[PDB]
């Protein structure tokens, strides 16, 4: 924490001239305070958001920080899988008038997970890249579905014009001890999905992820190696 800004419970860190990481925390029984990170991207006269915070109230804090500090309208948000860390604050996005997008499968799973679905569904080609007609006006956000991993619906995003790719919850940092897979993880394909993400954004040198500070491409290698052992 040096250069980090705080708004309420949220912490913000600039990653590049037009990119910030948002971080919110949830106190959990064993882990203590657990961070969830997402991204804010300034793209011309508009802002794009990747992932909510854990809660609606935390997510409203992101939006108020954007309003106060960047002062540009948030055009859209994309959420990266249907669990509370990434979709917990959908109601706040909706109340703010923001158009929301998620993988079709995330929207299908959302009711079962107790999450609110996004307003729009992204679909993907067989090579993993988003169908452009389902992601209109996404500017520099390049959305890629790497295959099943943490969940069957997890997606990732690269930011054109930067060194940054965001693996969301599929990628763990190079010091992580395990993947924390539950019954919805696909342990057969996890390693291939982590490598696919690596291959989709081969020029990214800063890997942003949900539960650790940004890492090098070591995070991708490490995640894939740990996943190799789940087979
Ligand atoms: O890697 C780590 O350090 C770390 C530590 C602790 C958790 C995680 C992952 N969190 N997570 C992912 S991913 N998908 N869903 C969740 C989630 C959903 C609800 C709850 C809660 F609290 F509400 F029940 C908690 C977690 C990752
Ligand atoms: Ca809610
Ligand atoms: Zn999850
Ligand atoms: Zn997560």
Coordinates of C-alpha atoms and ligand atoms in Angstrom, one line a residue:
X1 CA 0.0 0.0 0.0
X2 CA 1.8 3.1 -1.4
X3 CA 0.0 5.0 -4.1
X4 CA -3.2 3.0 -3.2
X5 CA -6.4 5.1 -2.8
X6 CA -9.3 4.2 -0.5
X7 CA -13.0 4.9 -0.9
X8 CA -15.0 3.5 2.0
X9 CA -14.1 -0.2 2.1
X10 CA -12.6 -0.3 -1.4
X11 CA -8.9 0.0 -2.4
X12 CA -7.8 1.2 -5.8
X13 CA -4.4 0.9 -7.4
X14 CA -3.3 2.3 -10.7
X15 CA -1.8 -0.3 -13.0
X16 CA -1.4 1.7 -16.2
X17 CA -2.3 5.2 -17.4
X18 CA -5.9 4.1 -18.1
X19 CA -6.2 1.0 -15.9
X20 CA -7.0 0.6 -12.2
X21 CA -7.5 -2.5 -10.0
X22 CA -10.4 -2.4 -7.5
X23 CA -10.1 -4.5 -4.4
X24 CA -12.8 -5.4 -1.8
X25 CA -12.6 -7.6 1.2
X26 CA -14.7 -10.2 3.0
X27 CA -13.8 -11.6 6.5
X28 CA -14.0 -15.4 6.3
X29 CA -13.6 -18.0 9.1
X30 CA -10.1 -19.4 8.4
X31 CA -8.5 -17.1 5.8
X32 CA -9.3 -13.8 7.6
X33 CA -9.7 -10.9 5.2
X34 CA -9.9 -12.2 1.6
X35 CA -9.4 -9.8 -1.3
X36 CA -11.3 -9.9 -4.5
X37 CA -9.8 -7.8 -7.4
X38 CA -11.3 -6.5 -10.6
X39 CA -10.5 -3.8 -13.1
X40 CA -11.5 -0.3 -14.2
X41 CA -10.6 0.8 -17.6
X42 CA -10.8 4.3 -19.0
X43 CA -11.5 4.2 -22.8
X44 CA -11.8 7.6 -24.3
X45 CA -14.9 9.3 -22.8
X46 CA -16.2 6.2 -21.1
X47 CA -15.3 3.8 -18.3
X48 CA -15.5 0.0 -18.5
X49 CA -15.6 -2.3 -15.4
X50 CA -14.5 -5.9 -15.0
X51 CA -16.1 -7.7 -12.1
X52 CA -18.2 -6.5 -9.1
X53 CA -17.1 -6.4 -5.5
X54 CA -18.3 -9.0 -3.0
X55 CA -21.4 -7.0 -2.1
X56 CA -23.8 -4.5 -3.6
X57 CA -22.7 -1.8 -1.1
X58 CA -19.0 -2.4 -1.9
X59 CA -19.9 -2.3 -5.6
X60 CA -21.6 1.1 -5.2
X61 CA -18.4 2.3 -3.6
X62 CA -16.5 1.4 -6.8
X63 CA -19.0 3.4 -8.9
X64 CA -18.8 6.4 -6.6
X65 CA -15.0 6.4 -6.7
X66 CA -15.2 6.3 -10.5
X67 CA -17.6 9.2 -10.5
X68 CA -15.5 11.3 -8.1
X69 CA -12.1 10.5 -9.5
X70 CA -12.5 9.8 -13.2
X71 CA -15.8 11.6 -13.8
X72 CA -16.8 9.7 -17.0
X73 CA -19.9 7.5 -17.5
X74 CA -19.5 3.7 -17.0
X75 CA -20.7 2.3 -20.3
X76 CA -20.7 -1.4 -19.4
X77 CA -19.4 -4.0 -17.0
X78 CA -18.4 -7.6 -17.7
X79 CA -18.4 -10.2 -14.9
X80 CA -16.1 -13.2 -15.2
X81 CA -18.0 -16.1 -13.4
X82 CA -21.2 -16.7 -11.4
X83 CA -19.9 -16.6 -7.8
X84 CA -20.3 -13.9 -5.2
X85 CA -16.8 -12.5 -5.5
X86 CA -17.4 -11.5 -9.2
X87 CA -21.2 -11.2 -9.3
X88 CA -22.1 -10.3 -5.7
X89 CA -22.8 -6.6 -6.7
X90 CA -24.9 -7.0 -9.8
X91 CA -27.8 -5.1 -8.3
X92 CA -25.6 -2.1 -7.7
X93 CA -24.4 -2.0 -11.3
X94 CA -28.0 -2.3 -12.4
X95 CA -29.2 0.5 -10.1
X96 CA -26.5 2.7 -11.6
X97 CA -27.8 2.2 -15.2
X98 CA -24.8 0.2 -16.3
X99 CA -25.2 -2.4 -19.1
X100 CA -24.0 -5.8 -17.8
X101 CA -22.5 -8.7 -19.7
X102 CA -21.6 -12.2 -18.6
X103 CA -21.0 -15.5 -20.4
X104 CA -24.4 -17.1 -21.3
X105 CA -23.5 -20.0 -19.0
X106 CA -22.8 -17.6 -16.1
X107 CA -26.3 -16.1 -16.6
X108 CA -27.8 -19.7 -16.7
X109 CA -26.0 -20.7 -13.5
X110 CA -26.7 -17.4 -11.7
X111 CA -30.1 -18.4 -10.1
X112 CA -28.7 -21.6 -8.8
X113 CA -25.8 -19.7 -7.2
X114 CA -28.0 -17.0 -5.7
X115 CA -26.5 -14.4 -8.0
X116 CA -28.4 -11.9 -10.2
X117 CA -27.9 -12.5 -13.9
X118 CA -26.3 -9.9 -16.2
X119 CA -28.6 -8.1 -18.7
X120 CA -26.8 -9.6 -21.7
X121 CA -25.1 -12.9 -22.6
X122 CA -21.8 -13.3 -24.3
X123 CA -21.2 -16.3 -26.5
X124 CA -18.0 -17.7 -27.7
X125 CA -16.5 -19.3 -30.8
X126 CA -15.0 -22.8 -30.8
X127 CA -11.6 -21.1 -30.5
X128 CA -12.6 -19.3 -27.3
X129 CA -12.9 -15.8 -28.5
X130 CA -16.1 -13.9 -27.8
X131 CA -18.5 -13.6 -30.7
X132 CA -18.2 -9.8 -31.5
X133 CA -21.9 -9.4 -32.1
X134 CA -22.5 -10.3 -28.5
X135 CA -19.9 -7.9 -27.1
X136 CA -20.6 -4.6 -29.0
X137 CA -18.5 -1.5 -28.4
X138 CA -16.2 -3.3 -26.0
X139 CA -13.3 -1.0 -27.0
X140 CA -9.9 -2.4 -25.7
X141 CA -11.5 -5.3 -23.7
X142 CA -10.8 -8.5 -25.4
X143 CA -12.9 -11.3 -23.9
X144 CA -11.7 -14.9 -24.1
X145 CA -13.2 -18.1 -22.7
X146 CA -10.3 -20.5 -22.0
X147 CA -12.3 -23.6 -21.2
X148 CA -13.6 -25.0 -17.9
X149 CA -11.3 -24.6 -14.9
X150 CA -12.3 -23.0 -11.6
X151 CA -15.9 -23.3 -13.1
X152 CA -17.3 -24.2 -16.4
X153 CA -18.3 -20.6 -17.1
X154 CA -15.1 -18.7 -16.2
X155 CA -13.9 -16.1 -18.7
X156 CA -10.9 -13.8 -18.9
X157 CA -10.1 -10.4 -20.4
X158 CA -7.1 -8.7 -22.0
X159 CA -6.7 -5.0 -22.3
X160 CA -5.6 -3.9 -25.7
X161 CA -2.8 -1.3 -25.7
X162 CA -1.6 -2.4 -22.3
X163 CA 0.6 -5.2 -20.9
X164 CA -2.4 -6.4 -18.8
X165 CA -4.4 -9.6 -19.0
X166 CA -6.9 -10.6 -16.3
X167 CA -7.3 -14.3 -15.5
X168 CA -10.1 -13.7 -12.9
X169 CA -10.4 -16.7 -10.6
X170 CA -8.9 -19.2 -13.0
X171 CA -5.3 -18.0 -12.4
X172 CA -3.6 -18.1 -9.0
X173 CA -0.4 -16.4 -8.1
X174 CA 3.0 -18.1 -8.5
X175 CA 3.2 -18.5 -4.7
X176 CA -0.2 -20.2 -4.3
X177 CA -0.4 -23.6 -2.5
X178 CA -3.5 -25.0 -4.2
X179 CA -6.4 -24.2 -6.5
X180 CA -9.3 -24.6 -4.0
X181 CA -11.4 -26.6 -6.5
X182 CA -14.9 -27.5 -5.5
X183 CA -17.4 -29.9 -7.2
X184 CA -17.9 -27.3 -10.0
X185 CA -14.3 -27.2 -11.0
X186 CA -13.3 -29.2 -14.0
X187 CA -10.1 -30.9 -12.9
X188 CA -9.6 -32.7 -16.2
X189 CA -9.3 -29.4 -18.3
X190 CA -8.1 -26.9 -15.7
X191 CA -4.5 -27.1 -16.8
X192 CA -5.3 -26.8 -20.5
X193 CA -7.6 -23.8 -19.8
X194 CA -4.9 -22.0 -17.8
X195 CA -2.4 -22.6 -20.7
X196 CA -5.1 -21.4 -23.2
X197 CA -5.4 -18.1 -21.3
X198 CA -1.6 -17.8 -21.6
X199 CA -1.7 -18.4 -25.3
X200 CA -4.6 -16.0 -25.9
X201 CA -2.7 -13.1 -24.4
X202 CA 0.9 -14.1 -25.2
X203 CA 2.2 -10.5 -25.0
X204 CA 0.8 -9.7 -21.5
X205 CA 3.4 -9.4 -18.9
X206 CA 1.2 -8.2 -16.0
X207 CA -1.3 -10.9 -15.0
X208 CA -4.1 -9.5 -12.8
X209 CA -6.1 -12.0 -10.9
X210 CA -8.9 -12.2 -8.4
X211 CA -7.2 -13.1 -5.1
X212 CA -3.6 -11.9 -5.3
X213 CA -1.7 -8.7 -6.2
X214 CA -0.7 -8.6 -10.0
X215 CA 2.0 -11.1 -10.9
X216 CA 4.2 -12.0 -13.8
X217 CA 3.4 -14.8 -16.3
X218 CA 4.8 -17.1 -13.6
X219 CA 1.2 -17.1 -12.2
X220 CA 0.0 -18.9 -15.4
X221 CA 2.8 -21.4 -15.5
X222 CA 2.3 -22.2 -11.8
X223 CA -1.4 -22.5 -12.0
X224 CA -1.1 -24.9 -15.0
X225 CA 1.5 -27.0 -13.2
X226 CA -0.7 -27.3 -10.0
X227 CA -3.7 -28.2 -12.3
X228 CA -1.6 -30.8 -14.1
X229 CA -1.5 -32.6 -10.7
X230 CA -5.3 -32.7 -10.3
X231 CA -5.6 -35.0 -13.3
Ligands
LIG1 O1 -7.1 -17.9 -3.4 C1 -7.4 -17.3 -2.3 O2 -6.6 -16.8 -1.5 C2 -8.8 -17.4 -1.9 C3 -9.2 -17.5 -0.6 C4 -10.5 -17.7 -0.2 C5 -11.5 -17.8 -1.2 C6 -11.1 -17.7 -2.6 C7 -12.1 -17.9 -3.6 N1 -13.3 -17.3 -3.5 N2 -14.3 -17.7 -4.4 C8 -14.2 -18.1 -5.7 S1 -12.7 -18.1 -6.6 N3 -15.4 -18.4 -6.2 N4 -16.3 -18.2 -5.2 C9 -15.7 -17.8 -4.1 C10 -16.3 -17.5 -2.8 C11 -17.7 -17.3 -2.8 C12 -18.4 -17.0 -1.7 C13 -17.7 -17.0 -0.5 C14 -18.4 -16.7 0.8 F1 -17.6 -16.3 1.8 F2 -19.4 -15.9 0.7 F3 -19.0 -17.8 1.3 C15 -16.3 -17.2 -0.4 C16 -15.7 -17.4 -1.6 C17 -9.8 -17.6 -2.9
LIG2 CA1 -28.1 -8.0 -4.4
LIG3 ZN1 -15.8 -19.0 -8.0
LIG4 ZN1 -12.6 -15.9 -6.9

